[PDB]
Amino acid sequence: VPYEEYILAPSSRDLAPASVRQVNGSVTNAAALTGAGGQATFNGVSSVTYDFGINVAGIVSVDVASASSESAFIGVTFTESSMWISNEACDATQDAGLDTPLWFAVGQGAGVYSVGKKYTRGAFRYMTVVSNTTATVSLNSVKINYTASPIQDLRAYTGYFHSSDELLNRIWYAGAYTLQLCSIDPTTGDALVGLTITLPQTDKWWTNYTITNGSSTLTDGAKRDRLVWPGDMSIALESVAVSTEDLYSVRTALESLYALQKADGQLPYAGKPFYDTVSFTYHLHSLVGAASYYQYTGDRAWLTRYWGQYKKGVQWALSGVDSTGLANITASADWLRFGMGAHNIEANAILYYVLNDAISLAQSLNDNAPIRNWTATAARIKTVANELLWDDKNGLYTDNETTTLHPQDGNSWAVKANLTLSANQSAIISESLAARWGPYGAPAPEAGATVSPFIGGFELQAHYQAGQPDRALDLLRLQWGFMLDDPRMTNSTFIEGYSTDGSLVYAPYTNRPRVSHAHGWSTGPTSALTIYTAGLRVTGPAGATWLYKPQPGNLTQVEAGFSTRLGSFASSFSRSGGRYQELSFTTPNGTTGSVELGDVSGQLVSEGGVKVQLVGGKASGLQGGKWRLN
Ligand SMILES: *[C@@H]1O[C@H](CO)[C@@H](O[C@@H]2O[C@H](CO)[C@@H](O[C@@H]3O[C@H](CO[C@H]4O[C@H](CO)[C@@H](O)[C@H](O)[C@@H]4O)[C@@H](O)[C@H](O[C@H]4O[C@H](CO[C@H]5O[C@H](CO)[C@@H](O)[C@H](O)[C@@H]5O)[C@@H](O)[C@H](O)[C@@H]4O)[C@@H]3O)[C@H](O)[C@H]2NC(C)=O)[C@H](O)[C@H]1NC(C)=O
Ligand SMILES: *[C@@H]1O[C@H](CO)[C@@H](O[C@@H]2O[C@H](CO)[C@@H](O[C@@H]3O[C@H](CO)[C@@H](O)[C@H](O[C@H]4O[C@H](CO)[C@@H](O)[C@H](O)[C@@H]4O)[C@@H]3O)[C@H](O)[C@H]2NC(C)=O)[C@H](O)[C@H]1NC(C)=O
Ligand SMILES: *[C@@H]1O[C@H](CO)[C@@H](O[C@@H]2O[C@H](CO)[C@@H](O[C@@H]3O[C@H](CO[C@H]4O[C@H](CO)[C@@H](O)[C@H](O)[C@@H]4O)[C@@H](O)[C@H](O)[C@@H]3O)[C@H](O)[C@H]2NC(C)=O)[C@H](O)[C@H]1NC(C)=O
Ligand SMILES: *[C@@H]1O[C@H](CO)[C@@H](O[C@@H]2O[C@H](CO)[C@@H](O[C@@H]3O[C@H](CO)[C@@H](O)[C@H](O)[C@@H]3O)[C@H](O)[C@H]2NC(C)=O)[C@H](O)[C@H]1NC(C)=O
Ligand SMILES: *[C@@H]1O[C@H](CO)[C@@H](O[C@@H]2O[C@H](CO)[C@@H](O[C@@H]3O[C@H](CO)[C@@H](O)[C@H](O)[C@@H]3O)[C@H](O)[C@H]2NC(C)=O)[C@H](O)[C@H]1NC(C)=O
Ligand SMILES: *[C@@H]1O[C@H](CO)[C@@H](O[C@@H]2O[C@H](CO)[C@@H](O[C@@H]3O[C@H](CO)[C@@H](O)[C@H](O)[C@@H]3O)[C@H](O)[C@H]2NC(C)=O)[C@H](O)[C@H]1NC(C)=O
Ligand SMILES: *[C@@H]1O[C@H](CO)[C@@H](O[C@@H]2O[C@H](CO)[C@@H](O[C@@H]3O[C@H](CO)[C@@H](O)[C@H](O)[C@@H]3O)[C@H](O)[C@H]2NC(C)=O)[C@H](O)[C@H]1NC(C)=O
Ligand SMILES: *[C@@H]1O[C@H](CO)[C@@H](O[C@@H]2O[C@H](CO)[C@@H](O)[C@H](O)[C@H]2NC(C)=O)[C@H](O)[C@H]1NC(C)=O
Ligand SMILES: *[C@@H]1O[C@H](CO)[C@@H](O[C@@H]2O[C@H](CO)[C@@H](O)[C@H](O)[C@H]2NC(C)=O)[C@H](O)[C@H]1NC(C)=O
Ligand SMILES: C[C@@H]1O[C@@H](Oc2ccc([N+](=O)[O-])cc2)[C@H](O)[C@H](O)[C@H]1O
Ligand SMILES: *[C@@H]1O[C@H](CO)[C@@H](O)[C@H](O)[C@H]1NC(C)=O
Ligand SMILES: *[C@@H]1O[C@H](CO)[C@@H](O)[C@H](O)[C@H]1NC(C)=O
Incomplete structure (x- = not known):
């Protein structure tokens, strides 16, 4: 395996914290819980925060050698970002409130205490062992069974990248490890168990919904959501393909999504048990994911199995194209961005990309009948999109025909798809998008004062496709070096999103600790560096x-x-x-x-x-x- 040193994934699924970060109260030999010889004696009300060095996941077990009062309790709290280290709570998963510590009544006696995979913590770097009682307890170990990428050899990558730019190398391997972390045992899905709360009140949490078939599946985020999402696939899939090559989790995810397609062809906003919601773009993303899964696996059997569903979904999308020649969107659900409606440049760009994917697939399958309609529709989308949505003054596409906003997602996708009328126009879009950069990355005005690494990957592909590799490398350094090296981050996995002012506020979430720091859709740099920089x-x-x-x-x-x-x-x-x-x-x-x-x-x-x-x-x-x- 080449460049193993860069692979972040643990060398063992039986993990103990790497180092002691903080001791509150009186604790003897805290380092005992880090693999150092000896035991840790918590004398009364005390606590210790340990650091794993990387983002990890799995089931905690507390080995108690001794306890005193029958009322003794040891709690364990988990968090991804150092912002939320607390002896009283974890980070958040739900729309409101923080999650409760796992409380093990060690007063019953010595032995190993655990609650199993029902209480899997999907992502955390810091772990706090809390003694909340006056009793004296002696602990031999507090360890975790690492349950991410559950059926894979974690350090047996099949892909690799190594440049003269070390920051880039570390970004690539951080994206790979993010994807490894987002691959879970399918029986431990749905962290949104709740689908107003202050620190004294804590929220019960559990992971016991089977979200997909099989033994492994790629979800949106390790800590949360632990559901399957089609939009994230548009980055996650290719970043997985060139690194771990664990396309099996992608396949189970995609199959679960297609199992939910409606008779009109409509594909889901998200896997079960999320609310049934119509999203033009995410249905399209399901189609994109199927197409690229065939592209990288070459599974002709699988493509044949699902070609009828794919054509039905294509037809469902095409049912929205009106007399203008463009799609008129009536579903606001997208990547949690605002303003999704009418003649969106992003929706029609994804639609153009999808129609070209479909033409390619149908030629691979010798299914020539739908080709003429698809080709003509795609050409018309291109023509009218550039007539009605191109703002020659500002050098960008507008969000629709009746707005002054120029979106990052729509313009990125319009470059990624061949929607531009010329290479010159793609260059203008690249320059105009780069001119909007802030001190913390590329902005997504369609979602307010937000920086979306998801859209950042598509902007990367746009920059590369315009003839500006160094622009894309500058965006990599600026944005992803922030997500990797900011002291509030994890230094191993990538964040779901944040704000243009550098705060970890994510506009749609009022519960700031629920922002997950390990999301697959933020791993665009891995596939970008492999496909475009390496070629x-x-x-x-x-x-x-x-x-x-x-x-x-x-x-x-x-x-x-x-x-x-x-x-x-x-x-x-x-x-x-x-x-x-x-x-x-x-x-x-x-x-x-x-x-x-x-x-x-x-x-x-x-x-x-x-x-x-x-x-x-x-x-x-x-x-x-x-x-x-x-
Ligand atoms: C700490 O966490 C780890 C997480 O990885 C636990 O280890 C995993 O334990 C599960 C338990 O089932 C193992 O799952 C099984 O995997 C089989 C293939 O294994 C592959 O990976 C190995 C990695 O080294 C490799 O060596 C091996 O050769 C092979 O390549 C797979 O065939 C099994 O199939 C079962 O499940 C199918 C899915 O449906 C079931 O889903 C759930 C699973 O939890 C089940 O409850 C449900 O009822 C469904 O039946 C099913 O279709 C099949 O018919 C069959 O029943 C199975 O998935 C996994 O391989 C282990 N991984 C590793 C790396 O060891 C570990 O156990 C835990 N620690 C402790 C102490 O428990
Ligand atoms: C995932 O975990 C959650 C818990 O975190 C779990 O939800 C719990 O499920 C159990 C069932 O397994 C619920 O307990 C039942 O609740 C119903 C409604 O209140 C009661 O009717 C049940 O009573 C039983 O016994 C009665 C006689 O004493 C019978 O008359 C009756 O018919 C039932 O047989 C029982 O109390 C529990 O309320 C929920 N709790 C929460 C918070 O959801 C969920 O099932 C798990 N999912 C899995 C494992 O797939
Ligand atoms: C053509 O494109 C235009 C540009 O996108 C569209 O106008 C946009 O419309 C949306 C939807 O109204 C506006 O979104 C803003 O959202 C924020 C936040 O609201 C969300 O979050 C709050 C909590 O903070 C929640 O309560 C809400 O329910 C939302 O989920 C609001 O503060 C804003 O007031 C506004 O609602 C865009 O601001 C707006 N942009 C512009 C430039 O007008 C337009 O809708 C499109 N055309 C059609 C026909 O849809
Ligand atoms: C150390 O932490 C443990 C774990 O949380 C504490 O045990 C908890 O004690 C509270 C006491 O109120 C239990 O709360 C509930 O209170 C209501 C009354 O408002 C009652 O109806 C419930 O039956 C329950 O008693 C909580 O369930 C319990 N948790 C566990 C897992 O047993 C412990 O008290 C703490 N010790 C100190 C010294 O703070
Ligand atoms: C070939 O592709 C075109 C798309 O370019 C498909 O045409 C579109 O079909 C949808 C329905 O599938 C039409 O929506 C309908 O519009 C009528 C108004 O005439 C409305 O009353 C209905 O409720 C529905 O909204 C859409 O207008 C239409 N657009 C165009 C430009 O024709 C066509 O169905 C495809 N044909 C095949 C055989 O796949
Ligand atoms: C991406 O789109 C550009 C245009 O925005 C494509 O380049 C254009 O390709 C068309 C043909 O596909 C050219 O138009 C016609 O070509 C025929 C020969 O097939 C010729 O007989 C006509 O006189 C006319 O030129 C067009 O000139 C050309 N324009 C430019 C600026 O290259 C490009 O092929 C698309 N790329 C992909 C990968 O789809
Ligand atoms: C954030 O992550 C970086 C790595 O991505 C961490 O820096 C790395 O730290 C290790 C040490 O743990 C360095 O390698 C070691 O060098 C020593 C000699 O000092 C040698 O004895 C070891 O065998 C090992 O080779 C590694 O070069 C270094 N890399 C970089 C780019 O800094 C950093 O510690 C992490 N920070 C936090 C707060 O997590
Ligand atoms: C140890 O005590 C310190 C206080 O010195 C705790 O740090 C505080 O954490 C909260 C968040 O819960 C922050 O808002 C405070 O600003 C921190 N204190 C200070 C002085 O800055 C820490 O959480 C405790 N750790 C353990 C393991 O109990
Ligand atoms: C695009 O779709 C919107 C609905 O999503 C259409 O809006 C309606 O347009 C009719 C035009 O006769 C109005 O009477 C309705 O009042 C509009 N809806 C609402 C809620 O006010 C719009 O017409 C569509 N445009 C095209 C070109 O198809
Ligand atoms: C559009 C999707 O938005 C997020 O999915 C969530 C849905 C609901 C809640 N919630 O209300 O708790 C939180 C997240 C997640 O980032 C996915 O990657 C993205 O594709
Ligand atoms: C997995 O498939 C089995 C039958 O093959 C089904 O019982 C189970 O509910 C499925 N789990 C899902 C779809 O999450
Ligand atoms: C390297 O950067 C310089 C700007 O200093 C630029 O002129 C040059 O084109 C870049 N190299 C390549 C191969 O693009």
């Missing part, structure tokens, strides 16, 4: 066809790789002064692909010796194997 782009099922387009920017060394069922993809180059010194790549045998290197002239040689001339920095029909530039 390894799958363009066919499981990599049957591919495209090598490294966009190094001002990077001097870049090495990356991942795997599919066809074989191993690898990229490696070193530059200086705007010229490649070395460039090599590997693709699975039997595949054919193309290369776009830029203002690079010379010849590519195969392992056999086949020589191909770069014409405009390009090449075509290239067989699979180890190729090098001379």
Whole structure:
């Protein structure tokens, strides 16, 4: 396994805290609970906050060697961010109030106390052991069984990335570990058990809803929600594919979502047991997820199984396209952003992307009948979207035909999809989006004074696709170095969202501690750095066809790789002064692909010796194997 040192995931599922952060009261040998030899003696009312170093998850067990009064109690509290360390409560999961400590009456006697997976804590970095009674207790250990990525070898990555920019490397591996943390045992889902409260009052919590079929599944957030969400998949899937390659949790998630499709084709806002809600964009995201799951797995059986449902969902989306040629949205539910309605640039951009995905899929399946309608509809969406929604003055798309707001999501998606009329226009959008950056990242005005890493990943893809890799690297540094290195963060996983002023306030949530610090949809940098900076782009099922387009920017060394069922993809180059010194790549045998290197002239040689001339920095029909530039 390459670059194992960067993999954050624990080397054992039997975890003890790494270090002692704080001792309140009189506690002997607190470090005993960190693996150091000995026992920890809590003498009366006391507490100790321990730090795991990384975000972890699982079931706590308290090994009591001794207790005094039959009324002795040891509590355990958990939190992701250091902001919420308390001897009286955990961080929050519900729309209001903090969650209660797990209270183990150690007064009954010695032994190991635990409440099992019903009280799984999905994410926490700091753990507080609390002695709230005057009694003296002696504890041999307080440990956790790590229950994330439940059926995987945690450090057996199949993908890797390593650049000359160490901050980027750490961002990549933090995103991978975030995704590992969001993959859970499906029987421990739904942290929103409650679907007004002050610190004295604590909220009961439990994880005992089976959200999907199978033995593993990828949810939106480790601590919460622990439901399946289609929108997050639009980043989570590709970031999983190039790192752990645990597409099984993605598949169970997607299958659970499709099991809930309605007779009109409408796909769910979220998996069970969330309220039945109509969301144009999230139905579309279910379609995007199916398409990209086929793209990376190449599972023809699975695609055949679900093609009828996919076409029904496409038709449900197309039922909204009106006389204008654009979709007229009547469902405000989206990524928790406001103002979702009417002729949204984001909805129609996702729709264009979806229609092109569907055309590609139907050509792969030789289902030519729906192709003409889909192609014509997509072309009309493009035309009328640029006629009615393009603001040439401000260089952005507006949210709809009757507003002055230019959204980050809509413009990002309009660049990611080929909705722009020209490459020049994509460049204008990239520049205008970058001009809005604040001291803490890219803003999403459609959701108020919010910075959304979710939308930040799509902005990254836009910047890369406009010809601005270094703009995207600057956004990576500015935003994700904040999410990684801010002292309030976790330094291992990525946050769900925050505010433009640098506060961890997330506008839709009044309960600030319920903001989860481990969300898969914030892992855009992993797939972005692998696909765009390193240049390894799958363009066919499981990599049957591919495209090598490294966009190094001002990077001097870049090495990356991942795997599919066809074989191993690898990229490696070193530059200086705007010229490649070395460039090599590997693709699975039997595949054919193309290369776009830029203002690079010379010849590519195969392992056999086949020589191909770069014409405009390009090449075509290239067989699979180890190729090098001379
Ligand atoms: C600390 O936490 C860890 C979390 O990982 C616990 O370990 C896990 O325990 C579960 C218990 O079932 C194991 O699940 C089983 O996994 C089988 C495949 O295992 C794969 O991963 C291994 C990783 O090393 C690997 O070595 C192995 O070769 C293989 O690749 C899987 O075939 C089993 O299938 C059962 O479940 C299917 C899903 O439906 C069921 O879902 C729940 C599961 O909880 C169940 O309650 C429900 O009733 C459903 O039946 C089902 O379709 C099948 O018919 C079959 O019943 C099963 O999922 C998991 O592998 C363990 N992971 C690791 C890494 O060990 C660990 O136990 C815990 N500590 C303690 C002390 O308990
Ligand atoms: C996940 O965990 C939650 C708890 O955190 C759990 O919810 C609890 O479920 C139990 C059932 O397993 C509930 O207990 C029942 O509540 C009903 C309604 O109050 C009562 O009628 C039940 O009485 C039983 O016994 C009676 C005779 O004494 C019978 O007449 C009657 O028919 C019943 O057989 C029993 O008290 C409990 O109220 C809830 N609590 C909460 C807070 O939800 C949930 O079931 C778990 N989900 C799983 C495991 O899938
Ligand atoms: C065309 O696009 C325009 C630009 O997006 C749309 O106008 C937007 O409409 C929305 C919805 O009214 C406004 O959203 C704002 O939301 C905040 C917060 O409200 C939310 O949160 C509070 C709690 O804080 C909760 O109580 C609410 O129920 C919401 O869930 C409010 O403070 C604002 O007053 C407002 O409601 C946008 O501000 C608004 N933008 C602009 C520029 O007008 C327009 O709706 C679209 N066209 C159509 C036909 O829908
Ligand atoms: C240390 O913490 C434990 C765990 O919370 C405490 O045990 C708890 O004691 C309270 C006492 O009121 C119990 O609350 C409930 O009170 C109502 C009356 O308002 C009563 O009807 C309920 O039956 C219950 O007694 C709570 O259930 C109990 N928790 C457990 C798990 O037993 C303990 O008292 C604390 N010790 C000190 C010294 O603070
Ligand atoms: C081919 O694709 C087009 C989309 O470009 C589909 O046309 C659209 O179909 C929906 C219903 O599926 C129409 O919505 C309906 O509009 C009428 C008004 O005429 C309204 O009374 C209904 O209640 C409903 O809202 C939509 O207007 C229509 N748009 C256009 C431009 O035709 C068409 O269904 C697809 N055909 C096939 C065979 O897939
Ligand atoms: C993304 O969209 C751009 C346009 O916004 C596409 O480039 C355009 O491609 C069309 C054809 O797909 C060109 O229009 C026509 O091409 C035919 C040949 O097929 C020619 O006979 C006509 O005279 C006309 O030129 C158009 O010139 C071209 N424009 C530019 C600026 O490139 C691009 O292909 C799209 N990319 C993807 C991946 O979909
Ligand atoms: C936040 O995370 C970073 C890593 O992403 C932590 O910094 C890292 O700290 C380790 C030590 O725990 C450094 O490696 C060690 O170097 C020592 C020599 O001093 C050696 O004996 C060890 O075997 C190990 O190689 C690592 O270089 C360093 N990396 C960076 C980029 O700082 C940091 O401690 C974390 N901070 C918090 C508050 O969690
Ligand atoms: C140990 O006591 C300290 C107080 O010195 C606790 O820290 C406080 O935490 C609250 C949040 O619950 C903050 O609002 C306060 O600002 C903190 N105190 C100070 C002086 O800044 C800490 O939570 C306690 N830790 C344990 C494990 O009991
Ligand atoms: C887009 O959809 C909206 C509803 O989501 C339509 O709004 C209605 O338009 C009719 C026009 O005759 C008005 O009489 C109604 O009062 C409008 N609704 C409301 C709640 O006021 C709108 O017409 C649609 N536009 C297009 C072009 O299809
Ligand atoms: C649109 C979705 O919003 C969030 O889902 C939640 C739904 C309800 C509540 N709640 O009311 O507790 C909290 C979160 C979550 O970020 C998902 O990733 C995102 O796709
Ligand atoms: C998983 O599937 C079984 C039957 O195969 C079903 O009983 C169970 O409810 C399912 N769990 C879900 C859909 O979360
Ligand atoms: C590196 O940054 C400089 C700006 O200092 C820019 O001019 C140059 O184009 C960048 N290099 C590449 C390969 O884009």
